Every structure is written in structure tokens, then in C-alpha cells.
Nucleic acid binder design. Structure first.
Ligand SMILES: [Mg+2]
Ligand SMILES: [Mg+2]
Ligand SMILES: [Mg+2]
Ligand SMILES: [Mg+2]
Ligand SMILES: [Mg+2]
Ligand SMILES: [Mg+2]
Ligand SMILES: [Mg+2]
Ligand SMILES: [Mg+2]
Ligand SMILES: [Mg+2]
Ligand SMILES: [Mg+2]
Ligand SMILES: [Mg+2]
Ligand SMILES: [Mg+2]
Ligand SMILES: [Mg+2]
Ligand SMILES: [Mg+2]
Ligand SMILES: [Mg+2]
Lengths: 156, 129, 205, 81, 123, 79
RNA sequence: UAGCUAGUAGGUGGGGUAACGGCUCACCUAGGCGACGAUCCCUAGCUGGUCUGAGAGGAUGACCAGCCACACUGGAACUGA
RNA sequence: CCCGCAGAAGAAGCACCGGCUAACUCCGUGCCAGCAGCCGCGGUAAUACGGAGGGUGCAAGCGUUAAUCGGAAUUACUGGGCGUAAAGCGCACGCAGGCGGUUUGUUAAGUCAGAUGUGAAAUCCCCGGGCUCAACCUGGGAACUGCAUCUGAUACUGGCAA
């Protein structure tokens, strides 16, 4: 019912008196295909357990995206750590033109046609967080008109 | 020294919206009054008033919707160090249309959509979104 | 210039039928469609996003018997054309004369229709065309030449076609053996398992 | 002398002449002054296989331009029609 | 930088050089094996890589790797070299095209014959 | 009206001639800034009256010397 | 590579060109150019365009077309519109 | 180009298969032979070397090399930075240069609009036409972001005067 997508499974490790303890991290995204997307990051000593933890966290943390006909509303910039992303609406048929983490985020969020570039670092976690920030700060004509106190036609 | 009062006005509004001040006060100008007219009439501020005949002080009332500020972004484009002039067919879009581009055209200060209506170009004073 | 290999291996790779055989019998008794070909067929393949896009492109290409250079020219033309690139690509692929012959039912499979086209057994608007990639426009009357109307291939092809779905944008006869190409088929009309935005993204890569 | 002649373009075996008013010294497909029409010798029927701009040609002849032989034949045929 | 600073001193490109300068922008060069020998590579690799000191027609004296399983290049052999360095070897920036002029093909290859100048064995 | 220019005299040492610096206002092709650029034209001056630093108005004409193709028309102001 | 320039910059007069012109000569002025890069040094035919690029740009100018330059090397003029 | 002939008849190879990157196992070798674009691989169980089967990509082509742009936001005008990663002159004064508070008036240089002239043809792009289709060749348009005038606006910058 909610579309799942595993992005990166990265093996980290901490050092202890005996030696090294190798654990695993899983990054996932959940989305219904219609503007409701969230991301989850989970650690466990084992990859399936990490994936399940990420799944639960992602399902518990979703945000609303004001999609427009399966594409974005206007050009947006998503900024987090060392990752900047730019996302631009595209006419239908364009498909999703983005990197790895951004592709996962948009495919599960339900965007069907978008152009996107990722400047700065391309670490999957920060890329995901920047993309989600950009989507959650993307406006829509209805609420833009509402906040400005005008009508949708009077805005466009 | 103060080498761009227009940028000063925009920065005052930006900082005021950030700090939740109800009104922001500043020195007045013809151009500042015109920009305030444009912003008010497209609903980015409530009201503005210029009080004083020797040192005219302009006061702009800022508006917040559900708690959040309305002027989410406001940028000075044609700055003194790099003036920007655009023709009626390269007038920019702000927020892909939702935003506005305050443009000084030959007939007064008036947004990009209105300039495209009246077939004018001019100096892109600022972007508002 | 033509994939002259075993056909059912392609269907086994893509996991689905591509109609590369006539359809007299179900392909399950002719190949293990569930199993990918080769020594390591039962292996469970974890595909990447590039894997997904690559296999999608191959599937549609193999269906129409198109090679990569020609299909890239199709994609470039579809992107150039106004509207949706994916549906434009599918429509350009459908416009191929061999595919039109197949749909109209003069060939049991697209390879059979291709050989009919290439052996000058097909006319368009009255003129003989032997170009397997000729683009059929609206209102054209794809026909069969008189010296080739007597081939049992065409008959068996027609009675095999009749038990499938009839392409709406076509009008075919079995007596005169003609067909009016009424309109360009729409992405909605074509089979919905083809997911062409994967091809679009792949060629945008 | 400024001459009105045919500059051959097209491809192999399929000529397509452009009627150009040019100095008689320049190369055939070289520098011209004005393009006044075209002529397709293998013109399929139904298609306008020959077009001349008779007002401009008359302008040049008045200015003193000489007319090539094939162009003269084309003008005769087009004004006959 | 500021726009005035850029006007006074515009952005500078990065010229770049060639990893294979002795080719002189030519895909291959004919050279003469002034020496044929073997050398040991950088650590951690260890083996006896086959190289030749070659005198190209443009006068450059260079060192060229020789791929394949055993060669037949004695000194004065006329070989054709191409670009593409060998990593574990210090400074060896070229290969010798197998099967070209004298650098005959590898004896008994079956895969990637075109990379080693081996004609197709009969079916 | 005839084409013309208006500039500032920088030298009158030449006999029956002046050198006029004409400043133009060109938008930089790359960076979009409006930069000052000044061209120096050797301007013919019959009678020889213009001084260093005056605004003079000039017109192109036939060549007159090696580097003098421009000539006065009127003096806009005295400085 | 920071100063370069002696017909050098300008004026007058004579000569010369199809034509204005230090184009050339005599004389008289001491100027002319240069940090908005003069002079020198190293590569280089230029353009329409071509390749790449989302674009801005970047690289290059094979074929085709416009312009220029050259014709074993260095110079000259003659006939000729 | 059209018709007739006879017969599947005369016509498939190249690279790759550890990750990037689509495609995997046996045997030989044993840090040797060798591979390699980078990370790297090879020391007696090698999906990384060589052979074989199987497979993948492309196809009368397939790879390697050379070269350019891209990716490279890695010279950042669009579009970067400078406390510690490379990067604020040791600090000042200051000419040229860059920028300039506020109101009225005037000018129309910048700026904007419109028009005219040019910005060769071809090439790119759009709508069509013709070679059985395509490559190709064409008709018409658009474009050639430009430049020069002329006529207007003159809000903002510039000049000028208060
Ligand atoms: Mg081919
Ligand atoms: Mg040269
Ligand atoms: Mg770029
Ligand atoms: Mg010679
Ligand atoms: Mg003579
Ligand atoms: Mg793989
Ligand atoms: Mg073994
Ligand atoms: Mg760049
Ligand atoms: Mg940086
Ligand atoms: Mg340090
Ligand atoms: Mg430091
Ligand atoms: Mg300091
Ligand atoms: Mg001011
Ligand atoms: Mg043109
Ligand atoms: Mg003023």
C-alpha cells in the first residue's frame, strides 16, 4: 500500500578492546505515489534488521508534498549538509531525471516528470534530506494565493 | 557607507519577517514608496505610511499567515555593482509565476506581469517570493 | 541486422512473452518462460535501476525487431516531436510497416510480417513498398499484392490473428486483404505493461 | 556582365538548379547577388517544378543583365504556361 | 570574485598536458626497439613486466609495455606503439600494438583476439 | 541630421589639430557590467582654438593626415 | 616583454596616385602612442559555421560558401579596364 | 526501375561478464604467467589471469588508441569560496578606478518600445514536398541574441542646475 525503496546499505564499524564491531546502516524511503513521502535511517548488526528499522522509521516520519499533476510546482532548491539539489518541473514525458537518492525519493513520492541536479556532496543521506526539504518548502498556487490573500487566478 | 537604500529596504523587511516584528521603519524615498506600493497592492505587506516632512520615515506593516512569514524570500537583483536591465520578452519569472519581479519600467515601478501586459521592459529591481 | 537467434530466449530473459512465436500453442509448453536462459537461470537476479531501464529498452526493441541505432533514432525523433516523448516513441514504433502488417494480421508474427514486407508482397496506397521500417501514415491502405495473396502464410496468419484482440485504429479485410490505418494508436490503446518512461530516462542518462 | 543563370545544387543524379543573378566571373555555385527562383529537371508531376520571379528578372534585364540560354527557355515556358 | 575583479583579471583555464606527450597527438607511432627487457613493478605487485625502450620517428626515446603471453621482440624490431600507461610500472606510458608491424600476435589466444593481434582460429 | 560624436580634449599640442578622448558605455559581454571605455580620436582643428579639457563635438570626414579622419563641428563648452 | 616612435605626430608648400592621405620631398613646429597593455616575444589564416552543452559557455574552423594571402626562394616592374 | 528464373539457395562477427556496468560457473596456473580505466586482483578452491560452457551489449560492424566538450558548481557571468580543509595584504594614507544619501527641474547618453536598412546563401529549428522509407535534396517560415539611424517613454542610472 505504501511503496518502499531501499537506497543504500552501508557497513560502518566501531572499534573496541577486542577489535572491530561491524554493523550495518540502511537508508529507505516510503511513499504512496501521491505527495506523501518520508525517509528512514536504521542501524543494526544485520542488514535485514537494519532495513526493517529503516522501514519503520520512514513510515513513522512522512511529510506532505503539494504535487501538481504528477510534477513539481516551481523550481526549488534543497539545502542540507554538504548537499545542494535543484528541482524543476517538466512537461509530461520527461520522466525523472535525477541522481540515485533523488530518483528514489521522487519515484516513491509520486513525482512522474521532473528535472533535477545535485551539486555539492552526493552522500545519499544528505541528498535525501535536502530533497525532502525542497519538496516540503515547495509551495502551491492555492496556498500562495491564500497567504497573499488573493485568488488563484489573480495570482496566475 | 549606505550605497544601496533599496537593498537596505529589502533587507530590513527580510530581517523583520525573520524576527517577527510587526512593523519595520526606515528612511523614505520616492523609489522606496513605489516599491512599497507594489508590494502592498500584491499583498506582501498590509499597509505602509510615510510620516515626516523633513526626515520622512516610512513604516511597513508585515503580514504573517498561519504564524509563518509571507515574504519567504526577497532578493535585490539590479544592485549598484551590477545593474540588470531586461527587455519585455526576457522579463523573468519568479516561483515559475507565483512570485513577482518588481520591475522599474518607463511608466513607473510595476511588476513583471504588468510590464509584460504593457509591453515594457526595464530594470529588474527585485524578486519577491 | 536482424536477431537471427533463438527467439524464446528473449522472452525468458524479459520474463514475459513478446509474441515471437505464432501463438498456435501456449509458449509454456515450448520454453521455461519462468526461467531465464542459460546455465544460471534459477538464480534470483537483484537488478539495479540501470538494469531495470536496460531490460525495458531491450523488451520493446525485441518485440518490434528493432536494433539499437534505429531505436535511438526513434527516440531522438520522439523527443523532437511535440507532446509526450514516451507515447510519441511508442506511436513511431507502431507506425513501422512491418508492425502495421502484423497488427492487420497478414503475419502470424512480426518476423513473418517483416519477410512479407521485404519480399514485395505488400503495397501502400497502391505502390509496392519493401522497406520493413516504412512509416505508415494516417488513412493509408496497406494491401497484399495479387501474386502473393495465394500464400498459405497469409491465410494461417489471418486465422491466427482473428483469435487475438483487434487493433481499433485499423480496419482489415480477409477477402480483399486490405487495411485502412485510421489513426495513430495511443499509449492508452497499446499494451499497458510496457513502461516507456524507463526508456526515456535511460536515453536521458 | 551580370548574368542570370542556373547554379546546380541537389545531389548525385538528381539536379536542382537555382536561378541566380550573379557576376559572370564567379564560380557556378559561388557568389551571387540574388536568388530569383528554381528549376527541378526531374520534377515529379503535381509539384511546382519551376518557379521564376519574373518581376525581379525583368528588373535585372532592365539594369542590363544578360540571360543564360536555359534560363531564357525557362522564362519562355513559364510565361507561356 | 567581484565582477570588477573578474573584468580586470578574467577566469583562467587549466591548459592541461598529455599523459602521452611522445605520441604528439597521433594515435600510434612507429618506433624501433633500442632495447627489450623486463622490470619489476611497484609494490605490492610483484612480477617481471616486459618492456622495451623505443626510439620513435619523432625522435622521442620512450619506454613501452608489451602485453600478451610472451613476445618475439629482439632489438631493432620495428613496432607500433599506442597510448595508455601501465599503473604498477614507473613511467611506462605506452603499449605496443600486438600484431602490428613486428610485434606479432600472442600465440594461442581465444578471447579478445582483436586486442592482441590474433587472427580468428578456424571453426 | 548627420552622424557625430562628442568628446573631451586631452591634447592640443598638435598644430591645427587636437586629440579627443571619447568615452563609450558598453555592457561587458560576459559579466554584464556597464564598463567605461574611452577611444582617442585625432581631430582636425582649423584655426586651432580648443584647449586641453574642453567638451567638443566632432564629425567624421575624409582622411586629412596619417591618423586624422575626424574634424570639429562646434565647441560645446569652454574649460 | 614598460617604455616605444625620427617621416616619427602635426602644419605649410611642391611632387605623386584613378582617388584622400607622410604616399614622397623641403622647411617649420615637438610632438604621437602606452597601464582601457604601447613595444617585443610565441603560436595563428579569418568568418558563416562544426563538435559538445540544459543553457551560458568551452573547443575547433576538415567538407561546402564569403574574404584574404601565396604560386621554388628573394626582388622588380611591363602589357593590361 | 519493372517482369521472369532456381534454390535456403551466395551472406555474422566483435567486445565484455568483481564493483562502477548489463552479464556467471568449472578447469589450468599459483604474487609466477599475467590483467588493468580507477578501486585493485593473482601466494593451492581466482565470478578479476588463461581456456571451456553459459550469458550480456552492439551488429557489417565491433573494440583499442589519439583529440575535443560534457560530467567538472573543478575558473563558479548563469554558478564557488577565504576562523581551523588552499585562500584576508602586518597596518595605514591615498591618486587613477569602482560605487554613491535626499527633493524639485531639465536632458534623453545608458535603459525600454516601435519602425526602417542591413545581419550573403547554405547549416541548426518549425510546417510541408520529392527520391519505395531513411540518409539526402528541396519550398516557405522562424532565427541570425547584433549593429546604424529615426520616432516616442523617461520610472531607475548618467549628465546639468538648484
Ligand atoms: Mg547499419
Ligand atoms: Mg601557420
Ligand atoms: Mg554544464
Ligand atoms: Mg613545392
Ligand atoms: Mg596601364
Ligand atoms: Mg552487474
Ligand atoms: Mg582454480
Ligand atoms: Mg564548467
Ligand atoms: Mg570550493
Ligand atoms: Mg594547517
Ligand atoms: Mg589554511
Ligand atoms: Mg588582518
Ligand atoms: Mg543616488
Ligand atoms: Mg542565413
Ligand atoms: Mg537625475
Amino acid at each position: 500500500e505504501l511503496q518502499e525503496k531501499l537506497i543504500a546499505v552501508n557497513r560502518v564499524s566501531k572499534t573496541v578492546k577486542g577489535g572491530r564491531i561491524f554493523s550495518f546502516t540502511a537508508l529507505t524511503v516510503v511513499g504512496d505515489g501521491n505527495g506523501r513521502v518520508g525517509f528512514g535511517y536504521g542501524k543494526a548488526r544485520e542488514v535485514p534488521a537494519a532495513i526493517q528499522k529503516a522501514m519503520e522509521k520512514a513510515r513513522r516520519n512522512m511529510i506532505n508534498v503539494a504535487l501538481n499533476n504528477g510534477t513539481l510546482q516551481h523550481p526549488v532548491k534543497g539545502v542540507h549538509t554538504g548537499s545542494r539539489v535543484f528541482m524543476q518541473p517538466a512537461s509530461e514525458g520527461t520522466g525523472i531525471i535525477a541522481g540515485g537518492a533523488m530518483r528514489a525519493v521522487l519515484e516513491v513520492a509520486g513525482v512522474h516528470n521532473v528535472l533535477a541536479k545535485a551539486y555539492g556532496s552526493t552522500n545519499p543521506i544528505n541528498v535525501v534530506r535536502a530533497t525532502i526539504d525542497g519538496l516540503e518548502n515547495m509551495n502551491s498556487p492555492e496556498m500562495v494565493a491564500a497567504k497573499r490573500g488573493k485568488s488563484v487566478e489573480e495570482i496566475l | 557607507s549606505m550605497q544601496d537604500p533599496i537593498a537596505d529596504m529589502l533587507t530590513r523587511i527580510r530581517n523583520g519577517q525573520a524576527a517577527n516584528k510587526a512593523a519595520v521603519t526606515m528612511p523614505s524615498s520616492k523609489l522606496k514608496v513605489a516599491i512599497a506600493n507594489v508590494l502592498k497592492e500584491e499583498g506582501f505587506i498590509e499597509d505602509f505610511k510615510v510620516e515626516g516632512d523633513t526626515k520622512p520615515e516610512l513604516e511597513l506593516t508585515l503580514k504573517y499567515f498561519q504564524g509563518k512569514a509571507v515574504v519567504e524570500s526577497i532578493q535585490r537583483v539590479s544592485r549598484p555593482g551590477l545593474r540588470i536591465y531586461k527587455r519585455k520578452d526576457e522579463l523573468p519569472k519568479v516561483m515559475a509565476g507565483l512570485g513577482i519581479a518588481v520591475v522599474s519600467t518607463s511608466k513607473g515601478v510595476m511588476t513583471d506581469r504588468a510590464a509584460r501586459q504593457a509591453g515594457l521592459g526595464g530594470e529588474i529591481i527585485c524578486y519577491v517570493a | 541486422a536482424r536477431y537471427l537467434g533463438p527467439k524464446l530466449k528473449l522472452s525468458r530473459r524479459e520474463g514475459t512473452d513478446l509474441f515471437l512465436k505464432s501463438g498456435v500453442r501456449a509458449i509454456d509448453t515450448k520454453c521455461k518462460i519462468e526461467q531465464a536462459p542459460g546455465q544460471h537461470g534459477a538464480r534470483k537476479p537483484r537488478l539495479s535501476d540501470y538494469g531495470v531501464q536496460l531490460r525495458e529498452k531491450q523488451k520493446v526493441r525485441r518485440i518490434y525487431g528493432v536494433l539499437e541505432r534505429q531505436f535511438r533514432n526513434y527516440y531522438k525523433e520522439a523527443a523532437r516531436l511535440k507532446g509526450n516523448t514516451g507515447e510519441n516513441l511508442l506511436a513511431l514504433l507502431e507506425g513501422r510497416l512491418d508492425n502495421v502488417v502484423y497488427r492487420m494480421g497478414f503475419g502470424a508474427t512480426r518476423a513473418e510480417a517483416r519477410q512479407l514486407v521485404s519480399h514485395k508482397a505488400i503495397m501502400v496506397n497502391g505502390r509496392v513498398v519493401n522497406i520493413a521500417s516504412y512509416q505508415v501514415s494516417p488513412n493509408d491502405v496497406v494491401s497484399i499484392r495479387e501474386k502473393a495473396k495465394k500464400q498459405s502464410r497469409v491465410k494461417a496468419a489471418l486465422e491466427l490473428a482473428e483469435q487475438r484482440e483487434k487493433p481499433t485504429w485499423l480496419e482489415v479485410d480477409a477477402g480483399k486483404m486490405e487495411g485502412t490505418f485510421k489513426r495513430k494508436p495511443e499509449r492508452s490503446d497499446l499494451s499497458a505493461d510496457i513502461n516507456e518512461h524507463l526508456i526515456v530516462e535511460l536515453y536521458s542518462k | 556582365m551580370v548574368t542570370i543563370r542556373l547554379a546546380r545544387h541537389g545531389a548525385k543524379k538528381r539536379p536542382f538548379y537555382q536561378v541566380v543573378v550573379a557576376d559572370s566571373r564567379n564560380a557556378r555555385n559561388g557568389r551571387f547577388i540574388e536568388r530569383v527562383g528554381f528549376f527541378n529537371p526531374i520534377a515529379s508531376e503535381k509539384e511546382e517544378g519551376t518557379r521564376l520571379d519574373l518581376d525581379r528578372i525583368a528588373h535585372w534585364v532592365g539594369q542590363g543583365a544578360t540571360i543564360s540560354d536555359r534560363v531564357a527557355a525557362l522564362i519562355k515556358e513559364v510565361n507561356k504556361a | 570574485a567581484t565582477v570588477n575583479q573578474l573584468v580586470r583579471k578574467p577566469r583562467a583555464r587549466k591548459v592541461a598536458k598529455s599523459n602521452v606527450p611522445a605520441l604528439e597527438a597521433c594515435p600510434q607511432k612507429r618506433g624501433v626497439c633500442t632495447r627489450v627487457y623486463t622490470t619489476t613493478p611497484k609494490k605490492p605487485n610483484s612480477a617481471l613486466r616486459k618492456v622495451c625502450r623505443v626510439r620513435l620517428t619523432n625522435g622521442f626515446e620512450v619506454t613501452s609495455y608489451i602485453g600478451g603471453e610472451g613476445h618475439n621482440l629482439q632489438e631493432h624490431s620495428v613496432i607500433l606503439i599506442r597510448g595508455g600507461r601501465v599503473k604498477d610500472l614507473p613511467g611506462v606510458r605506452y603499449h605496443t600494438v600486438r600484431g602490428a608491424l613486428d610485434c606479432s600476435g600472442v600465440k594461442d589466444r581465444k578471447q579478445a583476439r582483436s586486442k592482441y593481434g590474433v587472427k580468428r582460429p578456424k571453426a | 541630421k548627420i552622424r557625430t560624436l562628442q568628446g573631451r580634449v586631452v591634447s592640443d599640442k598638435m598644430e591645427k589639430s587636437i586629440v579627443v578622448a571619447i568615452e563609450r558605455f558598453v555592457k561587458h559581454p560576459i559579466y554584464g557590467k556597464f564598463i567605461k571605455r574611452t577611444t582617442k580620436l585625432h581631430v582636425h582643428d582649423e584655426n586651432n582654438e580648443c584647449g586641453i579639457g574642453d567638451v567638443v563635438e566632432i564629425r567624421e570626414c575624409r582622411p586629412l593626415s596619417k591618423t586624422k579622419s575626424w574634424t570639429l563641428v562646434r565647441v560645446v563648452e569652454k574649460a
